[PDB]
Write a protein that binds this ligand. Structure first.
Ligand code: ZN
Ligand code: ZN
Ligand code: ZN
Lengths: 569, 569, 131
C-alpha cells in the first residue's frame, strides 16, 4: 500500500498547467525543501506524509518538485527507515521512459572527453549520486571531499585513455569548447548545449523570470574572489566587524566547503551566536550549477537536477570546487606522524581474488568494458572489474605487547594513485578504511575484499542488492564496478598506499549519516598538506620519498601494481 | 671596427672558470642590469662602453651575462642608435652552433601541443621577442598587453589544428603533463623536462645556491593571492597604512601589469612619494619564470633566457598572466561609444593582394606551411601567408563637413577573432592601427597592405630587412609570416572588426619606445570590458550583437572571412 | 638554408610516419650499392625484396599503421601521395594524392625519356606469369 503509493507519486509526469520548477535553482530548492518539511509536519508516520503528498499533488503542485521533496522526506524519516521503505531507484523516474535509440558513435562525436561518457552516464554512479544529495557536524567537509574525490577519479580515468587533463572552471568567462549531447533517450526531456557555450554574462533572455533568478556573472565572480581572499587571510568575516571566524587546521575544510554550499545555518551553530556574512560569500556552488542549467536552456518548462554527473561541465565545475580544497590544504598542513599507530606495515599487495589463472601475478589486476545497458540510460560501455583484494602485513610495536586482555586497535587506510599523479595530495583515491585489532606480538596478514570496502556501495550492477549487506547498502557509496580505474591495455602503473593510525578513542551519527564518520578527517592523510613537505628544507622530499621510507615512517607502506584494460563483448 | 667588436663579444663562449649565470634569475638579472649601466657610465660613445666590455670580459665575467648586458646597452644608447649599430641577430648567439640534427617526428613525440612547435620555434618570433626584452609611462601596460596578445594568437593557432585550448598555469601545483624537448640542435646547451614535471615545492636539491635563490612555491602563491585580492578591492596597499593606490579604469592595467613585473621604481614615480608594498606583491612574473627554469635543471652551469617562447610551459604561464588581465578588465569597463569618430564605416574586407586567380573571392585568404630552416633552430614548419590587404569604406558624419582647411582626422583599429572565440574580449587579435584624414564629404576606400601593419615587424624572413622601412623596422614587432593565423584546410571562419575613434589631440616617446604609443590604451577597444555588456539588462547583448549593429554603432563595422591552410613543399 | 622536413597534421597521413625507415641513409646506400652488384640471380632479387617488404610491413604494424596493400591491381590509386624531403624536392618531386599509372602514356613526358608501355601490356605479362 505504502511503497505502491510512493512509486505512484514518483511516476507522475509534469503537465502543462503545472507551475514551472527548476531543480537546479536555489530559490526553487528552498521552496522544495519547505515542501519536504511540510510533509514531515503532517505526522510521524509515512501514511501521514504521503497523504500530505496526494493532497498537494491534487492541488496541482509540480510532480518533479514532489519527487525531490518526497525523496528527502523518505530518506530522513525514522518511520520510513525502520519500515525499510526508501526512495525508489533512479530507474523509476519518468525520464526512463518515452524504437530504442542508441548512442551516436561517430568520429564527429568523440572529440574532447566524450569517451568518458560510459563513466559519467554509468547507471550506478547516477543512482548513487542521486540518492547522495537526498541525504545531504561535517557537512561542508563531506560535500567538499566527496566531490573532490570523484574528481580525482575522473581525472585518473581521463589519463587512462590518454585524454587531456581536465581544465578547471576557474575562469568564469571560459568556453565549453566541446559541447554536450545527452544519450538519445534523454534528449527529449532535456537537451545539451553547442560547442563553445559560455555562461550568460547577465541572463538568458529566453528563460523566464520564473525559472531563474538573474544572477549575473560578475556576482558569482565576487563571491569567488571573496572566498579566495578569506582562505588566505585565514578568516571568514562575520556579520559583526571585530569577530571573524578564524580558520584552524581542523575547521578549515568544513567551513570552506560549507560556505561553498551555503550551509550557513549549520555552520552558524558553531560561532557562538555570530553569523557568517552571507552577502559576502554567497551561495557559489548552487548558483554556479544554476548558471550551467541556464546556459543550456532553449526556447516556461520544468528542469530537474536529473543527470548532473552526465554533463561534462559539472566535472569542470567540481574541479573548481577542488581548487578551494587545494588552497586550504596547503595553508594548514598536518604532521604525518601525528597519529601514527604503534605498528609496522609490510608487504602491501593488491591481488585478484582468483589466483588460479597461472601465469598470474601479485599486483596485476584487471578491469573490463562490456556493453551499456541502454534501458538504464548508459552509453558506450559498462565498466567492471575482476574481483580484487588487498592485503598488508601488520606487526606491533608497542612497549606493552598486545594481548587478549589489552588489544592494540588501529585503523588501516588504503589509497591509490596513478604513478604520474602521485606527488599531488589530491589525486590519491581512497579505497578502504579498515579496523584491525591485534592480540599477539606476532604479525598478521589482513585481507580485505573489494566487496567489503568502506568506500563502496554495497550492491551489484543496477541496484541489485547484496545479501551480505542487507543492513548497510551505502546506496550512495562509490559503485563497485567503478572502484578500479579503467587502466590501459598495456597495464597502467598505479601506486597503493597504506597508513596505520591510532584513532582511539571514539560514535558514528545515526543514519543516514553513519558513513563518512572519521575521527581523523575524511580523506586523511591526503586532505591537508604534510608538514613534512611544507617545512622541507632539502628539496628532496616528496610524497614519493616519504611513502617509500619504511625505516623512517614504518606505519606507512606503499607498493606498485598495474591495472589492465580489457573488452568483454 | 665597432660592429666587429660587438659580434666578437656576442660570440664569446662560456668556459669552466666563469662564475655561473642564470639569465632567468631575478637576482642575476639585477646584477646583469648593473653591468649594463656600468657600460653606459663608461662614456657617451660606444667605443667607451665597448672598452668597458673587453675590460670586464678579460676580468673573466660571464659571456652570457655580457650578452644580455651589452644588448641592453646597445639598444638604449643614443650614440648606438644614431650610428645605427644594433644588437646582432639572434642567429649570432653561440647556441646557433655546435651532422645537422633534425627534429624527431614520431607518433610518440606529437602528443599535446607539440605540433605548435613551428610557431613557438619560429626564428622571427624568437628574434622579435629576444629583442623585445632588450627594449623593456606605460611599461606595465605594454608587458601585459604584448604577452596577452601573443597568448591569444597561440590559443587561436591551437584551435586551428583542433588542439585543446591551453590550460592556464593558475594552479601552481599543476603538472606539465606533456614534457618538452628542444630541437636537437639546442638540446646540447640546455635540455627540457619529462612528462608531469612540476615546480619544486621548496627548491631543486641538485641546483646550486649560486644559480637560484630559494623561492618556495607557497611564497609565489602568496603574491598571487595578494594581487588577486587587490584587484578586487580596487587598491594596491602602499608602504603607508592609510594611503593605498586606487585602481582607476585608466591606471588599472598599467599597475597590475607592472606589479606583475616588479617594476616598482617606475610605478612608484606616480604615487606622490609613497611606495608600493614590495613585500606584499613581490615579483611574480620573473620568479615564476625562475621556477620553470629551476624545474628543468639537471645534474653549477650557466642558464640563458634564450628560447623562452619555445618552451610550451611559458605559454601556460603567459596564460596565467592574462588571467590578471581578465580580472581587471571586467572590473573597470569602458564606454564603447565614448571616443567614437564622427564617421560611418562600411564594407570591411580582407583580400588577397593578388586578385587575378579566378575563381578568387573577397574574404578568402591563404596561409602556407613550408619547410623549417633547421640552421635557424626551427622545427616542423615555417609558416607564411600569401600577401593580404584590408580595406574599409569611410564616410563622414560631422556637422561641419571635412575640408582641405579643416580635416577630420580619425583612427581605424583592425582586430580579428576566431568566430568561436568571438565573444571573449581577450581573444581578439590586433591587426592594424591606421590614421585616416578626410577632406571631402564623400566616401573613401582606405587600403592597408599586410606589410604596412602597425603591428608587424618590418622585415622579411630571417631578419632580412625591408627597404621601404629602413627607418622603422620594429624589430620587436609581430613577425610578418605569423600575422595570419594558420587556419584550416576547409577554410576556417574568422571575424574582422574595425572601429573608428577620435583620438585627437596628441607624442610618441623616443626610440626605442615609439611603437606602442596609443592615446586610447593599447588594444583598445578590447582591453577592458564594454559598459554596454556589463550593464546590459536584456541578456541579449554580446560583442557579436554590438559589432553587427551598423545602425546603433556606425563607427564599428564587422565582416566575416575565411583563412585557408596549405602546404608548400 | 638547410630545409628540414614538414611535420604537420596534414602530412602524416598514411605511411608517412615510416619515412625515417624509407629515408634512412644506410638503407639507401645499401640498396644503392645492391643494384650495382646485381646461378641464383632471380632467386636473390626476389628474396631480398620480399625480405625488405616483410620488415616494412612489420615496422608498419609496430606503429599500428594499416598493413600495406599490394600493387596487385594496376588501376589502383596511390591515395596518399608522396613528397621527398625538402632537400631532394629540387632534383625531383613526387606526386599528389590518388595518382595512378597513366593508362597509355604521360602526354607531357618526351618520347626520349619513355617508351610507351601502356597499362594493358604490363597487365598481360602479369596475367601470363600468373598463369
Ligand atoms: Zn553532487
Ligand atoms: Zn616575454
Ligand atoms: Zn631494389
Amino acid at each position: 500500500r505504502v511503497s505502491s503509493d510512493v512509486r505512484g507519486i514518483f511516476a507522475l509526469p509534469v503537465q502543462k498547467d503545472h507551475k514551472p520548477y527548476n531543480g537546479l535553482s536555489p530559490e526553487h530548492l528552498e521552496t522544495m525543501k519547505a515542501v519536504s518539511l511540510m510533509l514531515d509536519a503532517a505526522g510521524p508516520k509515512l501514511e501521514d506524509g504521503i497523504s500530505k503528498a496526494k493532497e498537494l499533488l491534487e492541488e496541482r503542485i509540480n510532480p518533479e518538485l514532489m519527487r525531490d521533496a518526497l525523496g528527502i522526506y523518505l530518506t530522513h524519516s525514522k518511520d520510513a527507515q525502520q519500515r525499510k521503505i526508501f526512495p525508489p531507484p533512479l530507474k523509476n523516474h519518468p525520464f526512463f521512459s518515452t524504437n530504442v535509440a542508441g548512442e551516436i558513435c561517430t568520429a564527429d562525436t568523440l572529440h574532447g572527453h566524450a569517451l568518458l561518457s560510459y563513466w559519467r552516464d554509468d547507471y550506478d554512479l547516477n543512482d548513487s549520486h542521486y540518492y547522495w544529495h537526498m541525504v545531504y557536524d561535517r557537512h561542508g567537509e563531506v560535500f567538499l571531499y566527496v566531490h573532490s574525490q570523484m574528481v580525482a577519479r575522473y581525472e585518473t580515468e581521463s589519463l587512462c585513455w590518454s585524454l587531456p587533463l581536465v581544465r578547471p572552471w576557474n575562469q568564469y568567462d571560459d568556453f565549453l569548447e566541446n559541447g554536450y549531447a545527452p544519450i538519445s533517450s534523454l534528449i527529449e526531456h532535456y537537451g545539451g548545449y553547442p560547442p563553445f557555450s559560455t555562461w550568460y554574462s547577465i541572463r538568458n533572455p529566453d528563460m523566464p523570470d520564473t525559472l531563474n533568478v538573474t544572477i549575473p556573472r560578475a556576482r558569482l565572480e565576487e563571491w569567488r574572489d571573496n572566498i579566495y581572499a578569506a582562505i588566505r587571510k585565514g578568516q571568514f568575516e562575520t556579520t559583526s566587524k571585530d569577530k571573524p571566524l578564524v580558520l584552524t587546521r581542523d575547521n578549515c575544510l568544513n567551513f570552506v566547503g560549507g560556505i561553498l554550499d551555503a550551509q550557513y545555518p549549520s555552520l552558524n551553530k558553531l560561532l557562538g551566536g555570530c553569523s557568517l556574512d552571507e552577502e559576502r560569500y554567497g551561495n557559489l556552488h548552487n548558483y554556479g550549477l544554476g548558471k550551467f542549467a541556464e546556459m543550456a536552456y532553449r526556447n516556461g518548462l520544468t528542469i530537474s537536477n536529473f543527470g548532473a554527473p552526465r554533463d561534462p561541465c559539472f566535472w569542470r565545475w567540481y574541479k573548481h570546487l577542488q581548487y578551494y580544497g587545494r588552497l586550504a590544504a596547503t595553508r594548514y598542513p598536518q604532521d604525518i606522524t601525528a597519529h601514527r599507530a604503534e605498528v609496522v606495515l609490510s608487504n602491501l599487495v593488491v591481488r585478484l581474488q582468483d589466483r588460479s589463472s597461472p601465469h598470474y601475478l601479485d599486483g596485476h589486476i584487471t578491469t573490463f568494458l562490456g556493453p551499456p545497458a541502454v534501458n538504464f540510460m548508459e552509453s558506450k560501455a559498462k565498466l567492471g572489474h575482476e574481483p580484487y583484494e588487498w592485503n598488508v602485513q601488520v606487526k606491533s610495536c608497542r612497549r606493552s605487547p598486545p594481548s587478549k586482555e589489552n588489544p592494540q586497535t588501529l585503523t588501516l587506510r588504503l589509497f591509490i594513485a596513478a604513478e604520474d599523479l602521485m606527488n599531488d595530495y589530491h589525486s590519491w583515491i581512497e579505497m578502504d578504511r579498515a579496523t584491525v585489532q591485534l592480540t599477539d606480538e606476532s604479525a598478521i596478514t589482513k585481507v580485505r575484499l573489494d566487496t567489503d570496502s568502506s568506500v563502496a556501495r554495497k550492491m551489484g550492477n543496477y541496484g541489485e542488492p547484496d545479501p551480505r549487506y542487507a543492513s548497510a547498502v551505502f546506496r550512495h557509496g562509490w559503485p563497485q564496478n567503478l572502484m578500479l580505474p579503467v587502466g590501459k591495455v598495456e597495464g597502467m602503473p598505479f601506486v597503493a598506499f597504506c597508513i596505520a593510525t591510532d584513532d582511539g578513542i571514539p560514535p558514528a551519527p545515526a543514519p543516514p549519516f553513519h558513513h563518512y564518520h572519521d575521527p581523523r578527517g575524511m580523506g586523511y592523510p591526503f586532505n591537508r598538506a604534510w608538514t613534512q613537505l611544507t617545512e622541507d628544507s632539502t628539496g628532496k622530499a616528496s610524497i614519493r620519498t616519504i611513502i617509500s621510507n619504511a625505516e623512517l615512517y614504518p606505519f606507512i607502506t606503499s607498493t606498485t601494481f598495474k591495472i589492465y584494460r580489457t573488452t568483454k563483448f
